[PDB]
């Protein structure tokens, strides 16, 4: 059974639950660093934060024009990032209603996101006429590395636990393994 | 005779010796009342707001409204001038502005003065109907 903190819900017997409140298709879900908080993003253009102890929404974030495609908690779970249709990468903290960092420079929609294990860098990938991967610093908001070579739509990004290697995959069946410090 | 304006492009009011004059020029417009236009243009928006809601805007909304007015004018004029040039005209007329305003924005201002199918379409429809029975 799943447990609820509400007095009326004391000793309730169910092992699955529903979170309702988005108005369009949901495209991302992210557990926070037991997990207490959930983040979701939808085609309606909003980001929602849910409590898994009372099973209700706490806050809505509305910094996007158009659909949001991906949302991700940070490695330790206070900052988070989001990206979608309007080509911009946004970084928030759960403390503030407005995004604290804006990342500009992709020429197309964003299709993948990833964090660095130290919590100070982010990775993004775009599609179509601009199939590149960009590395962003969170202190300044600028781009520090560009990786090029993919010719198909990119589906996944992943950084190694040692902070030195990057991996990407596309719809052609290839997986690219990159050195981060050399950019090769 | 009829008062006549200044033409030529040389300029008027220059205190020099290049005097040249018309038989009867038109008196320049002037006012000596006390209520200037530079101040009434700063209350026109308040007058409009009074009209609709029947100051009343924060500093951050008036800026957006003024941007709206600028963009509307510099947009309608651009479309209307090209439309006028399309149909073989050397001047801009109210009809072009009216067409743009009515077809792009649904705005109608009073007081300033059909398609049918041809035989091929009818033949195709007759063929389809005959096939359907």
């Amino acid at each position: 059974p799943l447990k609820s903190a509400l007095e009326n819900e004391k000793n309730l017997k169910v092992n699955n639950r529903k979170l309702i409140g988005h108005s369009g298709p949901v495209y991302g879900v992210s557990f926070s660093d037991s997990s207490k908080l959930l983040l979701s993003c939808s085609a309606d253009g909003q980001i929602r934060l849910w409590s898994l102890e009372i099973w209700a929404c706490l806050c809505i974030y509305k910094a996007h024009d158009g659909p949001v495609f991906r949302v991700l908690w940070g490695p330790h779970g206070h900052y988070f990032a989001s990206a979608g249709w309007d080509k911009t990468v946004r970084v928030f903290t759960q403390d503030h209603a407005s995004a604290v960092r804006i990342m500009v420079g992709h020429d197309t929609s964003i299709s993948a996101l990833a964090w660095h294990p130290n919590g100070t860098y982010v990775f993004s990938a775009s599609d179509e006429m601009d199939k590149s991967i960009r590395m962003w610093s969170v202190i300044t908001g600028n781009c520090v590395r560009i990786f090029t070579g993919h010719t198909h739509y990119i589906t996944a990004l992943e950084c190694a636990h040692n902070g030195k290697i990057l991996a990407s995959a596309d719809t052609g069946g290839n997986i690219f393994i990159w050195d981060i410090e050399k950019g090769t | 005779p009829q008062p006549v304006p200044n033409i030529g492009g040389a300029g008027s009011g220059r205190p020099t010796y290049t005097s040249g004059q018309p038989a009867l020029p038109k008196t320049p417009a002037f006012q000596l009342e006390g209520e200037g236009e530079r101040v009434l243009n700063k209350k026109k928006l308040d007058e409009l707001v009074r009209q609709v809601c029947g100051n009343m805007l924060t500093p951050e909304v008036e800026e957006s409204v003024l941007n709206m007015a600028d963009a509307f004018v510099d947009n309608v004029l651009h479309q209307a001038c090209r439309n006028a040039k399309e149909r073989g005209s050397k001047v801009l007329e109210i009809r072009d502005i009216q067409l743009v305003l009515e077809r792009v924005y649904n705005i109608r201002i009073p007081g300033y003065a059909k398609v049918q199918p041809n035989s091929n379409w009818i033949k195709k429809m007759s063929a389809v109907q005959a096939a359907k029975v």
């Binding site: 249709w85 299709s111 739509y153 719809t171 | 398609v115 199918p117 379409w121």
Partner: protein, 75 residues
């Protein structure tokens, strides 16, 4: 102009419905624009389909693509 995937006879039929007579150049221009709009719709539809981790295209994806482009919906 280029070679067109869309047949100008479709445009000629549409103009027939409204009693209009077209020349060659405007006909080719309209056909080219229709082809380009079809391409745009397909691109957006595939974007929405891939955002959901799928290889099957549904009517919902096309409807979302039309909604994002400011097009009047079809029912």
């Amino acid at each position: 102009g280029p070679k067109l995937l869309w047949n100008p006879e479709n445009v000629r039929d549409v103009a027939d419905a409204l009693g209009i007579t077209l020349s060659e150049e405007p006909l080719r221009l309209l056909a080219q624009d229709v082809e380009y709009r079809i391409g745009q719709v397909i691109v957006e539809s595939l974007r929405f389909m891939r955002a959901a981790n799928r290889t099957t295209l549904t009517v919902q994806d096309v409807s979302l693509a039309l909604r994002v482009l400011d097009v009047e919906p079809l029912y």
